[PDB]
Design a protein around this nucleic acid. Structure first.
Ligand SMILES: [Mg+2]
Ligand SMILES: [Mg+2]
Ligand SMILES: [Mg+2]
Ligand SMILES: [Mg+2]
Ligand SMILES: [Mg+2]
Ligand SMILES: [Mg+2]
Ligand SMILES: [Mg+2]
Ligand SMILES: [Mg+2]
Ligand SMILES: [Mg+2]
Ligand SMILES: [Mg+2]
Ligand SMILES: [Mg+2]
Ligand SMILES: [Mg+2]
Ligand SMILES: [Mg+2]
Ligand SMILES: [Mg+2]
Ligand SMILES: [Mg+2]
Ligand SMILES: [Mg+2]
Ligand SMILES: [Mg+2]
Ligand SMILES: [Mg+2]
Ligand SMILES: [Mg+2]
Ligand SMILES: [Mg+2]
Ligand SMILES: [Mg+2]
Ligand SMILES: [Mg+2]
Ligand SMILES: [Mg+2]
Ligand SMILES: [Mg+2]
Ligand SMILES: [Mg+2]
Ligand SMILES: [Mg+2]
Ligand SMILES: [Mg+2]
Ligand SMILES: [Mg+2]
Ligand SMILES: [Mg+2]
Ligand SMILES: [Mg+2]
Ligand SMILES: [Mg+2]
Ligand SMILES: [Mg+2]
Ligand SMILES: [Mg+2]
Ligand SMILES: [Mg+2]
Ligand SMILES: [Mg+2]
Ligand SMILES: [Zn+2]
Lengths: 97, 49, 104, 65, 69
RNA sequence: UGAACUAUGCCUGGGCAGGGCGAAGCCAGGGGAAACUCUGGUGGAGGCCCGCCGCGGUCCUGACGUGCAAAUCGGUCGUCC
RNA sequence: CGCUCGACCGAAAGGGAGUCGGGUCCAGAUCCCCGAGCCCGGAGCGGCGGAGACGGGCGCCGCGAGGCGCCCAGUGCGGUGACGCAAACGAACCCGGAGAUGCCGGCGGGUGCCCCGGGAAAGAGUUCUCUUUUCUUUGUGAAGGGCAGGGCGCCCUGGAACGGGUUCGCCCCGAGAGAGGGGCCCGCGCCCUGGAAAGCGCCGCGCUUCUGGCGGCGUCCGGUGAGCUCUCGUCGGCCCUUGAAAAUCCGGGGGAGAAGGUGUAAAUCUCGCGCCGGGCCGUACCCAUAUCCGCAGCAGGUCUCCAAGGUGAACAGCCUCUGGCGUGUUGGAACAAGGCAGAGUAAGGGAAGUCGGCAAGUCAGAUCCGUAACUUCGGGAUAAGGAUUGGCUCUAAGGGCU
RNA sequence: UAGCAGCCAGCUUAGAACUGUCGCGGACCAGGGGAAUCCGACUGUU
């Protein structure tokens, strides 16, 4: 239902920024087979200070966020610099190697 | 095989202890007269039956 | 898929080298040697083909450790004769002993 | 396999076994006979057909009718 | 292993002459008392929580207890 | 002195994909005045058929022929409840 | 007290009571360590508990709960029944059961494996474009208790033709079906004790021969299948083939005997538990294109178990994952003749080659059509002779459950 | 009451359109056939 993405370490070192990574999710989240408008108002994404929260009424498997997070790192040529790890439940942190 | 009798296992134990090389001090004791054991057997070349 | 092996020296599929697959607590599938299936007793009449009832079906020497009530029934010939052939032995014994009174 | 479910890759030139090997005729008869007799036993239970009409349709179904 | 269901029967088996030790396993939903005997390991599954301490102190003296955590 | 090879017999164990033709028995529907017939389905018989492992060893008179081998190798081939 | 008694040897695949889970080594392991059991043997006290043990009939003390005397019981009990209860005396002798029965075929129950669905969780892979994607991991021992499931010519009531029940096939019924209600057996399936503490998966911290340790979270929800094996049942088929013995164990018949006289005794098929013991021998490794045999690291020979994904009828052939390996007693550089092999290919002709169609060439799967002479009527027969076959988008028919 | 609604589940068969160079058991797997004569009946064995 409620999942978060903790990316405080990469934005503190000045590699990425939560402002661009948030906009990447709005255009690549597939809802009901489509990626536009997030299927309406069912899937709402909120962006805090270096912490993005995704909530929805459909199951919305959390490992889909890890699928798009790694898809975001490879797109920015830093796939070999960060490691998407689930520190706690309903969470996803980005750490170094 | 893995299933041995006590008599066969006792027979293989003696042939295993006879296959030891000649002690080094025996060579100096005999003045290199007995240099190597003339009854050394190999498990591939000589079979004991 | 794993290919498991035997656990004893006997490497043939004999009548006593029978196994079954069991899943261990270590998330493995190993062979587990089972005992041969027992047979319930038959009737002493030699007529009824079905086995006896109320009696365990185990190996012969297993019957040494079982209790007596697990090896017979509370009837007259229980454990050695079926109920249908007991009631026929009662009627046959009574009716034959009655014809031997009429002759006198 | 998802395409073979729609009939693709299963034409005449994609078969190398006898029709009785691809689908056993003895098992198609076993399926159908378990479907009809199960239907006849439900109509007799629900009193849609009596025991006299059930036995007639049972023998008629045992024959290829 | 045998499973005891009554609390009176557990204290009756825990006071045997062959009672080696009693192990207390605190699970998430219940708490088990595993008394070790000569042949079997009797286990009393107590689903209640406050009834566990009322039975932990009810154990006879001289029996070694081991709290498994 | 030998049946550790092989020949035959005995005791006790093990093993032999997938397919094909498809016999008795049975069900149903038609023909008959009876004798009894016809169609479909079912059934799964056999020192039966194609055929893998197995077990054999036809042909090439192939390879090899001081060989891998004091009898073997390849394709092909016989049989495989 | 003894006829079946004629010593004894003879199976590391026959018979044969009882051990499984986790961990550990440079090499050991169902044997060691930890945990959980089990079997056999042993007991005048065999150490306790329970069973055997249920009390009645006459008078009084008595307006009472109970207490006084005599006498008589009591080697268990329930169900119409199949049979069930923790036990529930019993010799000689007899009878029976299990040990202990072939091959083949059909079907059904259960595991294992495979497959499908979670737009499931934890890591990893791919991202130039697309991919809520791809890959890996998602667990429970023996023994006991309970319950699904399967089987039963097992019992009671009752009574059948308008015969009915029923299988893929059969088979079943007045010597009693169908239906209703029960009993027993097998349960290796599921829940629980074991048992999560452990085992795997992931994450974090401490540490670099005590260090080689401590913590966190997870170990999930379902589906079916002409799927493949194993196994337990069940119904058949075949034989001028009938498809082992014995140790050992049990039940019954039998009522010889033993037990005490009013609360116990004899006896207890542990009947709930406790106590002691289990000696001797084998145990490493190879098991075969280098640990066996063939003079050898010999292209030979040598008995078995386990066995995945795709194509396909297939345990065929070709490709891939787990696992294994360096091409099988050597490397490098050339591509002459002549060989062996690739069953290499070929203009026009098509057996003129040759002892001879030797050699290899055509044909080949499957579907739909069509198949003579002859015959022992079974066959011949895949006779012969034709057509169709990819890919893609649809349509139609064949099910289950409420 | 010439049965309907909801839900679930696979695997096969038949027909049709379109389409590529008339190619489609595309590799692999995989019977040449017919008319007669001699001998042995056949399977098996050496
Ligand atoms: Mg040798
Ligand atoms: Mg087998
Ligand atoms: Mg048929
Ligand atoms: Mg045999
Ligand atoms: Mg033929
Ligand atoms: Mg062959
Ligand atoms: Mg061969
Ligand atoms: Mg020969
Ligand atoms: Mg040859
Ligand atoms: Mg030659
Ligand atoms: Mg030469
Ligand atoms: Mg002997
Ligand atoms: Mg044996
Ligand atoms: Mg080892
Ligand atoms: Mg004992
Ligand atoms: Mg009493
Ligand atoms: Mg009493
Ligand atoms: Mg007493
Ligand atoms: Mg036997
Ligand atoms: Mg036998
Ligand atoms: Mg069978
Ligand atoms: Mg009945
Ligand atoms: Mg008796
Ligand atoms: Mg070993
Ligand atoms: Mg070599
Ligand atoms: Mg040349
Ligand atoms: Mg050539
Ligand atoms: Mg030419
Ligand atoms: Mg010429
Ligand atoms: Mg010529
Ligand atoms: Mg030829
Ligand atoms: Mg012909
Ligand atoms: Mg003639
Ligand atoms: Mg001639
Ligand atoms: Mg002949
Ligand atoms: Zn009888």
């Amino acid at each position: 239902l409620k999942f978060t993405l903790d990316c405080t370490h990469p934005v503190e070192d000045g590699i990425m920024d939560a402002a661009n990574f948030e906009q990447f999710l709005q255009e690549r989240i597939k809802v009901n087979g489509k990626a536009g408008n997030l299927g309406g108002g069912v899937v709402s994404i909120e962006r805090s200070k270096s912490k993005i929260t995704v909530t929805s009424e459909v199951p919305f498997s959390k490992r889909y966020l890890k699928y798009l997070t790694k898809k975001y790192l490879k797109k920015n040529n830093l796939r070999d610099w960060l490691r998407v790890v689930a520190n706690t439940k309903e969470s996803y942190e980005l750490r170094y190697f | 095989a893995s299933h041995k009798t006590f008599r066969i296992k006792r027979f293989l134990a003696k042939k295993q202890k006879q296959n030891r090389p000649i002690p080094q001090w025996i060579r100096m004791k005999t003045g290199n007269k007995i240099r190597y054991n003339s009854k050394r057997r190999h498990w591939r070349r000589t079979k004991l039956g | 898929v794993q290919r498991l092996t035997y656990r004893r020296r006997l490497s043939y599929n004999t009548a006593s080298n029978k196994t079954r697959l069991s899943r261990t607590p270590g998330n493995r599938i190993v062979y587990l040697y089972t005992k041969k299936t027992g047979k319930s007793p038959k009737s002493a009449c030699g007529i009824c083909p079905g086995r006896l009832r109320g009696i365990r079906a185990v190996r012969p020497q297993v019957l040494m450790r079982l209790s007596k009530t697990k090896k017979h029934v509370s009837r007259a010939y229980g454990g050695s004769m079926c109920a249908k052939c007991v009631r026929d032995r009662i009627k046959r014994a009574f009716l034959i002993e009655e014809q031997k009174i009429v002759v006198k | 396999t998802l395409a073979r479910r729609k009939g693709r890759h299963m034409g005449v030139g994609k078969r190398k076994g006898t029709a009785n090997a691809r689908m056993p005729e003895k098992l198609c008869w076993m399926r159908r006979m378990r479907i009809l007799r199960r239907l006849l036993r439900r109509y007799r239970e629900a009193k849609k057909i009596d025991r006299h009409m059930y036995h007639s349709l049972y023998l008629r179904a045992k024959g290829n009718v | 292993p045998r499973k005891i269901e009554e609390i009176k029967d557990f204290l009756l088996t825990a006071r045997r002459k062959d009672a080696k030790s009693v192990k207390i396993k605190k699970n998430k939903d219940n708490v088990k008392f595993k008394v070790r005997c000569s042949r079997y390991l009797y286990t009393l599954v107590i689903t209640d929580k406050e009834k566990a301490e009322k039975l932990k102190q009810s154990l006879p003296p001289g029996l070694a207890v081991k709290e498994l955590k």
